[PDB]
């Protein structure tokens, strides 16, 4: 939420990524928000993914939150499992 | 040459009816005689035309822009290979 963006850096940015992610078995950490950078690592994730041979997800991206750092908490908890998680944007 | 004079050639015959010659009689009296009722025959024109959804229309559309974005890198590529690039470096 303090961030800003211009051109010749985020192709930079999103170059590196697809070149390290869709090479070998690289795992790629970052946290859980759609923000700045933080949003287009993502976006780059699925512009590489929309187009991908073996389809499906060819990466594993993984995102890190704090419980007290989510909007939509009411529905996500439930006593054993029902499954369906739902998280309207 | 040939497959332009054969599409060409094709895009207006293609729209003959399968009915043989000595199966033209029911041909006839579906549309023929239905002709008369209206000042333009309104008949569904055969092509090979497809309408479009938004969602196929929206997945396509960024499926090309990023293989265009494959494609122009490839040119720049390219555009390095020519010794003309070399001889004004």
Avoid: C
């Avoid at chain 2, 009296?29 to 333009?40: A, D, S, Y």
């Amino acid at each position: 939420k303090n961030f800003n963006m211009k051109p010749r850096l985020k192709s930079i940015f999103r170059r590196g990524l697809v070149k390290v992610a869709q090479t070998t078995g690289a795992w790629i950490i970052t946290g859980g928000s759609h923000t700045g950078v933080m949003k287009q690592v993502g976006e780059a994730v699925r512009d590489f993914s929309l187009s991908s041979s073996y389809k499906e997800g060819e990466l594993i991206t993984i995102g890190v939150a704090t419980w007290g750092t989510v909007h939509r908490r009411e529905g996500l908890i439930h006593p054993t499992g029902s499954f369906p998680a739902e998280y309207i944007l | 040459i040939w497959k332009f004079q054969r599409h060409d050639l094709i895009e207006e015959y293609h729209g003959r009816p399968a009915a043989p010659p000595p199966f033209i009689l029911l041909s006839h009296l579906q549309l023929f005689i239905k002709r008369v009722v209206l000042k333009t025959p309104a008949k569904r024109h055969k092509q090979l035309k497809n309408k479009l959804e938004k969602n196929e229309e929206a997945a396509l559309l960024s499926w090309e822009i990023y293989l265009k974005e494959n494609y122009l890198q490839n040119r720049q590529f390219q555009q390095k290979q020519r010794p003309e690039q070399k001889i004004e470096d």
